[model samples]
Target: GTTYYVSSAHGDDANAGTSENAPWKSLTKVNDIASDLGPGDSVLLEYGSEFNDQYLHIKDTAGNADAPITISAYGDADEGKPVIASNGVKGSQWEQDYRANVGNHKNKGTVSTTLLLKDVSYITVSNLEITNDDADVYDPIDTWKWTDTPDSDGTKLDRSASRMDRTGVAGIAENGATMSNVTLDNLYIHDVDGNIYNKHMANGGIYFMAHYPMENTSAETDVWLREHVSRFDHVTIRNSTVKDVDRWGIAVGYTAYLNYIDANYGDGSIDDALIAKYGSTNVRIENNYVKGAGGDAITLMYCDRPVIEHNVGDSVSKHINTQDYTQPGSYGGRVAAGIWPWRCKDPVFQYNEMYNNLNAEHGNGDGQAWDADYGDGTLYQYNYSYGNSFASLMICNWYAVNTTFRYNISQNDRQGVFDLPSNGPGNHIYNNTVYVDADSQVLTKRSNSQSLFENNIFINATNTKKTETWNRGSQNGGQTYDNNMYVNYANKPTSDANAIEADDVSAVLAGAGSAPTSALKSGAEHARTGEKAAFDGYRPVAGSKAINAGKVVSDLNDYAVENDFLGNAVKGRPDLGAVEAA
Candidate 1:
């Protein structure tokens, strides 16, 4: 199976590009045949043409595991896909430049990526639309800043050395790579304007960077994890559609640990939903659809055990800063999340859908729709959130061990539906179904110690004020609250003992529009204003008292998930929040 063709409009790298009238026009003739390309080879690219200036590298190939190599896109399926455009190329060359107390940065450019892929593996890069937005470059001051600090003469700066720094540009890059079973299907990666602010140059829209780049290092510092190292394995990015990227729409990294899986041709090791920084490991992100991202639309730094399913993160953290460019003034900001797992380990966020994740007015974790941050066995199941302004399930800070947030669904979020930050404890918030139509919804218990709240459902769909559903601030002592179900607003869970305090919150169910109008409806509202919730058709309604009032537990430690959240089934003590009533 050998086919190569690549025409930036009527081929001619002097023939022999394997048919299509013998095509082959630059990208240096596909890196001059990239070391001979093995296994069922195939390259294609020319559907509606447009390749502009370099990049199509695909270095050091190696295909196997049943015929691998294939870079997609051919012709008229409505004449689309296939457009690299790393705008006019010509970047690269910044030997040195640094002097900061304020912008002097310089690493210069070379326009970089538009498909780089080094040290390849059983590859596959489908459809494709990629961009590196140069638009004649813009960003001359007032906004374009840099700083890893270092200037009283110690040097070391370059927050992307100039050319408006677009950091390293990208639309598919894999620097210093060594991939394995890789797959980046249906790609459409758009507008990439590059590094909105030193994400340590692993830039935007699909960028994985295992190692290589010393002399001052800084793969976001660790200085190449104590000096050079690289390897990425078993990567799979599904469906794909990264938009308006300025940074992160897909990013991963590694600079240490040469083993974690992959004994040779590989099947494990290396990861990222948007990032798997520092060291990579088993990753698989699904059904992608990110929007307007300026940073993190899926993050899993220091990767390992990442699964991240059914993704759809919208309006993610759009560039925010209030100092802390390595302590410039301090404060620090830009902490987004629409799916997160920092310092990764056993991460598995299920059936996801986060909306309007906002945080950029000095952003600092104010727009979360999912976050385990730190991380260790984190598991967030059956997810769905709406109007996120902050906390739609954010365990927050420090180590984050044993994390677990079961069958989820939050509606009209603005401030709380579970925040818990304060060096997060072994967290475990069960069942789950929160609806707080603003009045400043709150559930922010700042964690005292290995927290755990049982079978949940906290409603206040804005039924008129009194919405302070648990704000407990400093506590840290092995917390655990039993059976929960409160409807019709107001705080109460202090000395809890089977709480269920409902008083006809619309007779306990059936249809409560504002977000998630069915699926075992239960209404509430303290300050309702126009439509929101629609989390989707839940279940529970038949003799509804939340049906079996959930209280069944069988060691929900690994965050159990036998079904529910629409897939039903969930016997043994099931029937609580994320649907399971029938």
Candidate 2:
């Protein structure tokens, strides 16, 4: 119920921290009283103060929705955000070898993070500058665990230990309870160079791990059986900047509950029973800027009905280190993308701009912009993509179903247009516009996946049809194309049932081969029809062949076809591509 002040520059550890005049000097004081933090308590760090080496780890705490515990800044804007750094120190509070849950190093070490929220709820962490880049040590096994472990100033920790991960902020739920109502906002997180090849969210700028202990064990009340699961609900991460971090920029959620499902029900099937027991709900990741990630910029996993929108990211998925570059291991050359979801249901990814994402020397997703890796009821609407190494979207895995890609714009993306690696049904690509400028770009339609391409427009400026595929490689006819218009393509699909082909790059669309400027759709603008347009670039021309040339699919699978990309009402039979002709 009290407000605590921490100032490393002007306070003493022995002072009463409840008042600004008598502040605490170290985070140790906060840690000593962390368990006592209840509803309406505030731990405000003095702005522009440096809290080095020591970190903040709050455990086993919660507050009510009415009065949540807050950790924020307490000084003028000119003073700058409070800086919390691990300075290459071991995670002093981490007691579990949890990294093995994601198939990462289990015996290596826990993460060394600046801020951690473990088994807590109704909490807010915001308005702070966080970094963990003061020290760079490759061999964490020898140096991080023991007191003798040291990286900076010629301190060799245990060289025996493998490389451990690091993070600016992390949330972990492991108390066999549901974590809920945590808001992380306006935090400037950067330069957290953790394990470069470790793609788990734990090694990133910000991450959440729902670690389920006692895998497959039922409750003791029922014959000493065991099943201890941890999850999150009502989690929101917004208005934050995460850059220059390894592996991930903002990985919101991950869970070990899938392991339990594999042990009991099966693997990769039965989403109804699995998601009911595993996934987090009411999660929102939006309005954040991410740049310079070593891997995928933002990934949401095991989330139900999560809305990821209006996020802008660039210069991501570019950095790749050989496994032996930091540690003594050998793996393949890696690849990544900008934003994606895994094992999530009903994910709405829209109003986001992902550009200039890079593939690795060896590409898988290959620096693509967006991906719906595996889940159910996925929707990609009203997003912008440009200058990415791969296509605009890559949908992978047979477990993925009910994906709808509509009302989106793409320009100059390379490699392929659509990468369909899954054999899943319910993949629908409709009402989108793409402008291709590369000389060796085409669409990828792998066999065995059920994909429907309808009511879309592809302005192939170069008429190029080169791509990477295991056969089924063609300029067309790989996926089911119907009522789509292709402009300026040298080669056409051999089996488009109702395809409309043309050669005018400019006559068919407004801006060919040019990227459009876009912004995320506001909450008030969602599903509001009768808008003029969505973007300035890439749309069908008025009175062009694309106008009124689309197939009106009656039975909507993912969502109803009511509005175009820019809220233009589909007053009639509908038009081809992302926007309706003026």
Candidate 3:
């Protein structure tokens, strides 16, 4: 194996003695040098230089456990180490944004970008700042101002520059070679320049195209098929910051799997922190501290087998566009929901701290919220949702399957609505500490599915249960209600709106509620104990009714080692929540 070094001023530094002192002649000179190196080879990439005209194409893979290739920026700093920029590329690299016109009416348009990848794998890129000045590179106004439109000033682009024609630095797969085991750590990716209008577009730091040749496009000619079953493990992407991309921060597609994304920061005028394409599957998004992410902080569209846990978000999700606004023909699109799931299954969404998720739900998971599709074996447990505009939580499109929701803290929502899919299936609701500060109902389920509500703590601070059910222009019956505590704050034995009592829980579940399938044994591993206590009331008091009241549904009740999304310490026999306090 050989070592490769790339810098604006270095040339073949590995063989030709390119060091911090000798330096490389150009970034392209490292293209050939990187080929001879194998796994475990290291690339000492220098930062703080703008490699505007250079595209460092790394086309080979030489990485392993002992010899895993290490590609890191060369620098040291308390905050960000150094900045490396790809401002623009020259020549025939111009991309067609529009079709060519004939003769005098020629309508041929072009866009330019930087950093193109041919074929690479098992790589790690870290500790540098990357920016894509696509607007400056490709604007017809910037070059031929007369031919540019009004919105496209041709000379100066506001934020919506990419809207006319897209251009930016790309993290891509070329030559039919799929890039895997890639880690981008401690980096800053931003400035597609579409910040002014926050217009939804596509072009970001990292782009994962899961399905090659999607929709049978020419790009799919030599498409490599990556399966969904076996996970893309040993994959870690953490501690990065992204902002001001034209479209989304991270556009995840195809069969991308098993990514450990933690401690990452983001703020941007994009649609989502992460968006899953219709066919993407099997991913875990956890423990990210995000602010200013535009739409769905996390979205799943036709995604299967994912675990979403321990993430906190702010300021971005409030911009969901619910006026049936989408790409021209779509019913509803853009920023409508924080975490939207369509046609999915086997997802565990628990222990998350979400604030201002969907600022307002305009339906379809828009606003700071989540929407699910029809699926089986899905569980939404122990989430703390607050400061939302519309329904804090809405589980819809669930037609015919078992979906269990329990032990969550929902507050400050317009309404908490659960619309059972067309013909819903077995639904179980239990042991949630629900406080409806607004007009949102404590329990609102309007589905013909065999619904089951049990042992919930629905504390309505307001004086209304403003909800509706269908019955031939009257009341449409739903499911079996059992052990659901509907306590109004005014008539509570305990006067704490923040704290709930066992009598409030027992009184609610006993009346107009059906019995559970089976009673669970006390301390039977799967039962909730008085261990977890938090301000949201997930932890029951020493003599609270919630203690030892959990009905065991599965034998897998060992919380001693259960890892939450943020890698928190979860105690066994403690209710499924954020803490395990005495």
Candidate 4:
């Protein structure tokens, strides 16, 4: 175990670099010695003076769980004083950067605070507040705005003032890092530099990558996956507060599994609190309380086998229409979603609550609230949704199969559930309470897809007085109904559709009996939130129609709380939505 102390604004810079008056100019020494640093190796960051423009990068050759490299505030209690947190900013490259890297990867300017940690694992960052100072990081000009200005000899758009986007420009960039068997405990991550990300643009907080734009020669030969295979398992992040992180706070990329984000509070962000993408698997998110986000609190995208339960989002705002940019031609910037899943499969969303989520609208959607795309083995039960502009659970964009949605509470939404624009696959709907407005309660046949409807309570969801319940599309992919409750409704079917499509529950058994059965703590579930019954307010009753109707989920462990980023609890009989009621 190695121990190093960093605190020198002046003289001790060359004092033979020992314990007494340790000579270190900057905090980079801790990052420099990360390779040799092992378990119990303590890197003490003095907590008196202010740190400015300091970027610490923990290389991939860093620490393991047995001997994790620790970075924390050092105090003698008598001599060291309280950890006075005078701050800085942290940000990452936006989607614009990804597009720019595709066009050309050359001489990008020194715009934002960037730390590129490629292929690292089992790391923990504690007692630190990060922020950036650059204000020109976001580009107001989107892709379609580029069509007007072109050069003579194969030139591109005129991005003169702003730099072309790249990947991973944040306080920390953990790319290709296998984060199994890790713990990030007792930390507070917030107070970001609000000025860095332009109010007219998007940004991110912690950017962990799966795969970025790689040179064709080396892209196929990624070496980091041989040992870990793109997974973030057994990872724990707890007791933290992430605020004002534009776009996102934690973004997981490609194929993460068994990771835990619990007991964290997020407020005042431009977008969701956390986002999982690039095929995440066997992930558990529980017990975190998020509020005042500029967008959705948690969004799972392009993945499978994740349990999102017991997390609460309060007073969150949504996106509004950015005046469609048709200056030169058609400005072609794509839209983003709230609880987004792109080509995802087999996810369980239960017992989560979303409220007051319609204020600042600047996400990937064109005023659409929550959206899901082409999915299978997806179940939504015992959840709460309210105060969204458009559809609370809007499943469009593509196709799906064997999806079950039931026993959820939705109120004050534009539309109850829009099962529109499908490719082809029947969905199971039962026992959901929807309070909506006018125009239409259910919009169908956004595409040719199979679906079933049953036992859902519908109320006022539209604003206008004219309330239309069901508007069927031309391409009906086997639609059927049974005991479904409705309000101000009628089935205006263009074609008389009758027939229920069955479900194929195979391929979704990926994590069956495979999750670890070990106890995270002796009595973690009851000791924290006082048993599953305590969360029944967020779920339906025991005798409800949606109870015991979900697919089997083994590995019943942790529970989801409001302010903790621990592991999620896998309940007995796996209640419908993101978590179990009792």
Candidate 5:
């Protein structure tokens, strides 16, 4: 094992770099020989020091399974972690050269970055702060695109054409190599002034790309889709804070090609705030705080077995711009919301909290806290969301099949509690609590989608007038609603035969006062148990109708979720809501 040090305050480029006393000065000195650093080697930077205008590019480095190369901070806690700024760095590469700009306006008017770990394996980067906000205002968007034919030197770029610009830090696999076992922890990445609409060259706090070299051949025969290299495996990003970034907070694993034939959407790419894109397996993104993101908080696309848990985020997906290719229009046009698993398998999202998320000006899925978009075997359990604009949980799209939403809490949301789309496979929604604030639809089931709603508690805050309970769509075959407690509301259901509606609110809640004092209590002593509540006093109260009213669902055994939201065991019959009454 060896330890190397880099210090901008007291370091020399020509030093031995073996100890802290004789540390290296620049990241270039270490990156030049990074391929030679094998197992148990570490590169540590001095705390409170700033490494400006240069990127810490670590390439071709390999570490064994027993020991991985670690890049971290070393010093007292009060001194603070090292800072990597992209200020004063001149542009070297140009995405487009309009009117012949030089030096400062190179690389699309954006500065270089701090770290770019490319094609490395068994690496861990932690305790670092990276910032890339050199230019305060947005880049000159007029000259970003090209239209007419060039002059003698081909430098005439049409200033009126709309161009796609991008910039950010990332870990990418290019050339002919693969990266594995990469972990990023305790990182505070913020203040990146990249364009929100750019997703081509760069757009993420931590972008992971698997760009493989392919040969474009004739469409009649075959185009070689090369594999075995240029991918990321066993990647984990935890205990990190990515804030104040213009675009994506963390993006991973994207495919360069379209759906094999043509482009998928605009420019054939999609970039969210946090994402796990193409060619990612066994990815874990947990326990992180993401705020003020201009787009969706997290998205898992084309990955396998992704587990996202314990995340607390607010004020996200607020960008009402048309850059989101999923919808139409720009700036006050479209919007997005919470976390979703797109085109992935066996993705589980649990124990998360999202609140105050608003929708677009046109009102799509922007206010939704969770959406299962084009994925199979997607499970959302033990999650809590409140005060969202449109819907709390929206499960739709053609490919959303074999999904489950259980033991969740949705309170005081503006619109419907559960928003089901027109077409999909049979979905299971059970053991949840939906607390509505009078003027909203509790359930909104769209066309032809089959979903089973069982063993839930639906309560309306207003006691004077009747609140609508169910808005079932036109389908009839696979829909099932049974053994649910609907309190303080009349069933103006379009169609529901098995729901129990009652006027006495005290029969379900123990002490129902105002907005804060509604506690759930079912009188089911023999039932197994409920999970913990997301808020205080939301546990199942004693001698309430919600207890022991749940039906036994045998299909739940396949999910392997033996416990409730609060980590309580599901022994016999379970309670109606999220909380367990011990």
Candidate 6:
């Protein structure tokens, strides 16, 4: 184990590179030694150095649990982190057939990566700056614009194989490769202007792909790749920032484990045996901030027990152009959200804040803060939402169970609060405080087998219309509600016999003041208002209606909710919303 130095200013490739004085230059020197990077080794680039038109790709390296390989900075603190401005340095490189789901080292496409970690384990990459936003290669018709693209129709225009996707930092595991104990921290990844309309998650700021080896076949080449599947385990991405990226900010790809597992094993019901072999575990994404994403800010799928907390996402889906989701190609689906989980079991999203995530102009094509999409035991609790174009939370799952939304706060989120596309079993929505914006929003489906709204508070910021609650249709689909409080609603939902409708509810949040008697101008009105929800700002004020006005819900199914939004003890018989009495 040793420490190597790379300095562009005062370095030569022929030097020993063992010290700051005798440093090596260029990212190529690091890539040459990537396979030999041993345990407890450190490759530290000078903080102010720039590796322009170059990238770092580390492959076939492994470290033990106690001694991990680390790539970080070495220069003075004021010099800033090392910058790898790839600038779309694409010529002859290994490329993947993204549409056909295949990767060939010899086959060529134009995608480039700033820092690529391929099939490595027990590694840490931190304290760096990265960018690859070389987007001028595309024709004008396929420009990445968030505003109106009414003329293009969103059908793929001209990003051919010569100019394709790009990534800031990526970790890819394939063909039964296991990437374990990988940690990425304190990275400032920005300006990843990848292919805006690509359907896959490859064109993103920070991406993790457990790509399956399905399309590659030859006598000698295909047997090993086809027999093996790929996954990640114990991967942590924290204290990082990703901004001004296209398609995604931080994306852990669907992992392709379900297709492999369901085809070989049984019906995708994840358990100890299947998870140990197929699915990922101990994944943590925390304390990150993402903004200016053309699509989703953060997304994960096909993992088990991943904890997503203390993250903030803003300005997502800046490039939605009508609802071209059903257009003529595979690169359609222009919908987006802040953070979501897909086909992942027991994933928890808590203590996060999401704001200004825009929806499609058609108003129903996926714009929300959080979404639980077909994963079992997905708990979204203690999070804060504001200024999103659509709902605060959406349970868009048809086969998920035990998905609960408790002790969270929503301020001025439009369209609706919860979008229940399918009613899963043992799901509960309780003790949440939803503040409807001036545009007026609805609570989708009202209540059903997902457990009727209970112990919640609905505050309307607009006096023009009621805090609307919508069932599936005019006919009752066994809709029910209980012990909920609706404030300033012109028409109250009559499904619950014990629900209360009040003209006024006092200031529930500490600094939010009294309930609003007016409508908000737009989502920007509450983007950064009042106390931050990740802290104690959303707590119930001392003697307000939010204090001790709710019933304690004990119907948790294999999940636990023992604290308030800020992880405080739920004091005195549960308050009406996400927080307890101050």
User: Global lDDT of each model?
Assistant: 0.61, 0.71, 0.42, 0.41, 0.61, 0.70
TM-score of 4: 0.61
Q: What is the TM-score of each candidate against the true structure?
A: 0.34, 0.85, 0.64, 0.61, 0.80, 0.85
Name the top lDDT candidate.
2
Model 1 RMSD, rounded to 1 decimal:
20.7
Q: Please report how far candidate 3 places residue 293 from its true position, in Å.
A: 2.8
Ranking by lDDT: 2, 6, 5, 1, 3, 4
TM-score of model 5 vs. true structure: 0.80
- lDDT tens digits by residue: candidate 4, 254-291: 22221211112121111111223224445555554444
True lDDT of residue 290, candidate 6: 82
Count clashing pairs, candidate 3. Answer: 46
**Ranking 3 against 6 by lDDT, winner:** 6
**Tens-digit lDDT string for candidate 5 (327-404):** 232323245666776655668888776665644333344557788766567789988776766677876655566678
Which candidate do you rate higher for TM-score, 3 or 4? 3
Per-residue alpha-carbon lDDT of candidate 3 for residues 1-582, written as tens digits (9 for 90 to 100): 555455554444344634555556456665556666567777666665555645444544546556666656664454344444445445314432111111121122333334333235567766766666554523321122122243244334343322432223333332223345666666665543322222222233334432222222243321322221211222344455544443344433322221211112121111122222223334455544434343445443233456666544443442233321234232223444444444345567766555554334443344434444444445677666665555555545423345666666565655553444343445565555555655565434343344455545655555453332311111123545443444544343221233333325333322211111111211011123334222423444455444434333231211223432223444444332222334
Off by over 4 Å in 5: 87-113, 134-168, 175-178, 199-201, 218-229, 257-278, 321-333, 361-365, 444-448, 475-479, 492-497, 502-534
User: What lDDT score is found at residue 572 in candidate 4?
Assistant: 48
Q: Candidate 3 at 255: error in angstroms?
A: 6.7
Q: How many residue pairs clash (N, CA or C atoms closer than 3 angstroms) in each of the candidate models, in the order given?
A: 28, 16, 46, 52, 14, 2
Give lDDT: candidate 4, residue 248. Answer: 43
Model 1 earns a TM-score of 0.34
